[PDB]
């Protein structure tokens, strides 16, 4: 694809240059929010000292604003320079909207089918290595949907662009009870059904 | 809060006095697309899908991080040299897929609520440091401006091998060890 860009961080006003060690941390976050394709796009650039967000530009506002008393000198300075304001406003297109075109061709088309396995522990339905995050898991006892007795872990982010989730069922197995785990995911046209028979 | 279908960080920009060290990375829906190796001047995408089809010039990162260094000095003075507050990290260890002895799997160590972004993550196999088959993410951003980081250990599950994820952070009084073991 074409070379992608990030948000350009505005230059701060300055003209030049215990038991644990000291650390001074600076963070700048160029954040793009997308809703309903690119019909609703919002750019929020955040300027953070340590963990204190002290100034930000918000495309819904159109100018920089101070967040904490640490921010007025920066926000006033950045709002007075046309080379900072107009360039930041343009990033809604040059950064957010353009990069989204490459997300549409890669990240937003990534469909990894979930792996569904059943193992006793409480019956555990492991749904592993799927993407994107939207998933629906249901327990069934002989074509009867279980509503009580189901405990699911939160959605688990593996950090490698896959998710997993464990859905557990407190049950009493008899000789005729057949338990099935039903999983729905955008990578699947039809649900995955895995059976466990006592 | 801001509700949206998709959230991207087209610029997680980090610089800190300890080191000193920095980080430039892009995120989409909470996952890392790439980081820029500032020393080697290379864009390192986190999926082979991304390197084949996407471009990002590392010079954009080097330029932006140099600005962060300038901004940090300016706000250090403005804040009367207010240092970062150490947070207590949270560690969790789990496997990537259901464990079956003899079948290759992956141990995952999630170090959450990291601040400042300075941490040691070490895998122990039967009490000894293991670096073979080890990889990790960069620092991943959080909405409260702390970080999390995930380390991976590829391993062969066996009844005679136990593991620990050793995490060292200034917010901890001593190294934190989260233990993990197979089915039996």
């Amino acid at each position: 694809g074409q070379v992608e860009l990030g948000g350009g961080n505005a230059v701060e006003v300055c003209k030049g240059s215990r038991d644990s060690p000291e650390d001074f941390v600076y963070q700048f976050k160029g954040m793009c929010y997308f809703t309903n394709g690119t019909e609703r796009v919002r750019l929020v650039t955040r300027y953070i000292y340590n963990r204190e967000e002290y100034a930000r530009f918000d495309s819904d506002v159109g100018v920089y604003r101070a967040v904490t008393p640490l921010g007025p000198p920066a926000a006033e300075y950045w709002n007075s320079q046309k080379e900072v304001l107009e360039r930041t406003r343009a990033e809604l297109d040059t950064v957010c909207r353009h990069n989204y075109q490459l997300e549409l061709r890669t990240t937003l088309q990534r469909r990894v089918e979930p792996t569904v396995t059943i193992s006793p522990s409480l019956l555990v339905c492991s749904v592993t290595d799927f993407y994107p995050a939207q998933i629906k898991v249901r327990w069934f006892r002989n074509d009867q949907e279980e509503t009580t007795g189901v405990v699911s872990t939160p959605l688990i982010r593996n950090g490698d662009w896959t998710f997993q989730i464990l859905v557990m069922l407190e049950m009493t197995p008899q000789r005729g009870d057949v338990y099935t785990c039903h999983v729905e995911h955008p990578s699947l046209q039809n649900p995955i059904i895995v059976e466990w028979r006592a | 809060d801001i509700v949206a279908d998709h959230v991207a960080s087209y610029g997680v920009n980090l610089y800190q006095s300890y080191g000193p060290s920095g980080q430039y990375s892009h995120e989409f829906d909470g996952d890392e697309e790439f980081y820029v190796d500032l020393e080697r001047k290379e864009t390192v995408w986190q999926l082979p899908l991304f390197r084949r089809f996407r471009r990002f010039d590392p010079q954009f990162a080097l330029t932006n991080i140099a600005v962060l260094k300038h901004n940090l000095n300016c706000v250090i003075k403005r804040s009367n040299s207010t240092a970062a507050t150490n947070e207590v990290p949270e560690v969790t260890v789990f496997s990537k897929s259901p464990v079956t002895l003899g079948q290759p799997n992956t141990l995952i160590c999630l170090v959450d609520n990291i601040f400042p972004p300075v941490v040691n993550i070490t895998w122990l196999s039967n009490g000894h440091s293991v670096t073979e088959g080890v990889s990790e993410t960069s620092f991943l951003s959080k909405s409260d401006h702390s970080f999390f980081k995930i380390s991976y250990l590829t391993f062969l599950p066996s009844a005679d091998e136990i593991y620990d994820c050793k995490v060292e952070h200034w917010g901890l009084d001593e190294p934190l060890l989260k233990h993990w073991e197979p089915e039996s």
Epitope: Q2, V3, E4, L5, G8, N9, A10, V11, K15, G16, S17, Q81, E83, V84, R87, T88, A90, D93, T94, H98 | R55, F56, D57, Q59, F60, L62, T63, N64, A66, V67, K69, H70
Partner: T-cell receptor, first 115, second 114 residues
Amino acid sequence: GVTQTPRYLIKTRGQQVTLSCSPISGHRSVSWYQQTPGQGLQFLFEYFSETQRNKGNFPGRFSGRQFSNSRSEMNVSTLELGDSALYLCASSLSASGGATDTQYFGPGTRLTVLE
Amino acid sequence: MQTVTQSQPEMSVQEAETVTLSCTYDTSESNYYLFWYKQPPSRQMILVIRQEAYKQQNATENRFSVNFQKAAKSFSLKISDSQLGDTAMYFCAFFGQGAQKLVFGQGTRLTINP
């Protein structure tokens, strides 16, 4: 505007040279270029906030630096006859990361290297 | 000779007439800037025209204008009402927002005949 000194300079092979540049008032970025008839305009390096942000492909004997008021110097040690060139300084506002696209040049330094 | 191409080493034009200087470029950048510089015999590099990739409106500065064809990657400079003071070396320049290096073409020598 961008000012440079010396405008003209004669040196012999092996000597060193230090060139001075003062950017446009308020500009934070200074870029250095070498113009020869055989290679055209060749980028040396770019300085911002007293540090080198961007580098060309010149050998280590070509070096530069930038001071607290954003004035810049560049240096060429062990001068070669091929180093005879016009050495150009260009300044950019650089009020945000990446905004060095518009560069305004100084008059340049005419350096002649002789045996 | 690869990122910016000026295929005309020398160009001449009659005074008060119009001349067009050719410039094509090759890049993968999505956002970038295109320039023309005028270098008279004084060797002073003068910035004449600036064009932004995301502003498809052709840039104009009085007698100077460009024909920016983004899809063709062409950035020709038109000098209207050529003056004797337009005699100079003209350089086409490219600056990608990612690589952030100002790159110059080989240059085009323009002579205005009185």
